[PDB]
């Protein structure tokens, strides 16, 4: 995906602006996104293929873009286009400083169907194979790069000094790792896009997907799906759980989320998941079981297990510590949170007393 904005002239905002966009080929435009533009009063899109006066069309006019960003998630039926016209009206006051117009993003299919289909599918398959080979090479480079580095445990003053002031070789190796990872994710996204396009073209032949022709038992479905699909499902499902809780009295929900369930859910989500699902899991737990008696003892057990000097699991200690602090602040009304923490601190200092 390309991205680079362009400059304008006669920066005064009172007058009209004109931008015309052409893809050089008919495009099955189906998605348009333009960020919020504060110094702007109006925005419109005009669409044509053969000519502005021959087959010109318009599809949306935006007015509140000053504090908002228009989103056209799914344009159905997909308008066939090659030429796109942008017309915006800046702030009514014609006095303004230098500003850059955000172009936005536009997604759509390049190949149009109601023949090229067979050879287009063949060349797309070849492109997918080449992208897969390049992605495999990038994965090998990243794997052999990370294999040579290590994270010192935060259990000594020397490691603390290392974390405070990274040595130069650590900085350069981190830069190399970040570059390799960025290349790997770019190639991964390209491969996924190519595979999706190939799948769509194959669907155009009527060859529907396998779609559970072997089994339908959930214990295999959950253990055969992809990791990213599971993450997306968890994010949406946790979001819906939060919405359901905010809309109330679901007494059944509090019954299932007992001490063991809370332990397992926390250890599975807040330790290994993405920051969004980690924060959402923490907030759901503190909203559900915040008032429980066993709560607080939960926090003490979690802290003692995770931050023990004998812990071997690798996890982002600082982020989960911030999450624990946020949960403790929210669940502060419970009397057991500080009692359990002080009892834990009482036991750690026990060797001082003979």
């Amino acid at each position: 995906p390309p991205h680079q904005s362009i400059i304008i002239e006669r920066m005064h905002s009172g007058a009209r602006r004109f931008v015309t966009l052409d893809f050089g080929r008919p495009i099955l435009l189906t998605d348009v996104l333009i960020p919020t533009c504060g110094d702007l009063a109006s925005l419109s899109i005009d669409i044509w293929t053969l000519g502005e006066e021959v087959d010109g069309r318009r599809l949306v006019v935006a007015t509140d873009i000053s504090t908002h960003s228009l989103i056209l998630h799914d344009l159905i039926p997909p308008p066939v286009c090659r030429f796109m016209k942008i017309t915006v009206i800046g702030r009514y006051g014609s006095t303004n400083a230098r500003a850059k117009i955000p172009l936005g993003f536009y997604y759509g299919h390049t190949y149009i169907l109601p023949p090229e289909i067979d050879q287009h599918l063949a060349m797309m398959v070849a492109l997918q194979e080449d992208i897969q080979c390049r992605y495999n090479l990038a994965c090998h480079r990243l794997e052999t790069l990370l294999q040579s580095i290590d994270l010192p445990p935060l259990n000594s003053a020397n490691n603390a000094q290392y974390f405070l002031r990274k040595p130069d070789k650590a900085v350069e190796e981190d830069s190399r790792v970040f570059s390799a990872y960025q290349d790997c994710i770019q190639l991964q996204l390209q491969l996924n896009l190519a595979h999706n396009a190939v799948q769509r073209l194959k669907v155009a032949l009527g060859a529907s997907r396998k779609m559970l022709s072997e089994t339908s038992n959930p214990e295999d479905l959950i253990q055969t799906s992809s990791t990213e699909q599971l993450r997306t499902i968890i994010r949406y499902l946790l979001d819906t759980l939060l919405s359901l809780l905010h809309a109330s009295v679901p007494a059944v929900l509090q019954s299932t989320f007992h001490a063991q369930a809370c332990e397992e859910l926390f250890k599975h989500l807040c330790i290994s998941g993405t920051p969004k699902i980690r924060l959402h899991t923490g907030l759901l737990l503190v909203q559900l079981c915040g008032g429980e008696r066993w709560w607080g003892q939960f926090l003490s057990n979690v802290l003692q297990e995770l931050y023990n000097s004998e812990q071997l699991l690798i996890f982002p200690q600082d982020r989960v510590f911030m999450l624990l602090s946020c949960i403790g602040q929210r669940s502060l009304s419970n009397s057991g949170v500080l009692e359990s923490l002080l009892n834990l601190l009482d036991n750690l200092l026990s060797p001082l007393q003979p």
Partner: protein, 42 residues
């Protein structure tokens, strides 16, 4: 949410569906912001 919707007057009036389909999401996004920032667990 920007309340901006494409010019589908010309097509059959699915627009009232599209507004409320847009409204389907809006009553969800605000509640979550009210769920996590607002309504501190008490």
């Amino acid at each position: 949410v920007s309340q901006a919707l494409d010019a589908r007057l010309e097509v059959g009036l699915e627009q009232q569906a599209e507004l409320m389909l847009k409204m389907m999401s809006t009553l969800e996004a605000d509640s979550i912001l009210q769920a996590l920032t607002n309504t501190s667990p008490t």
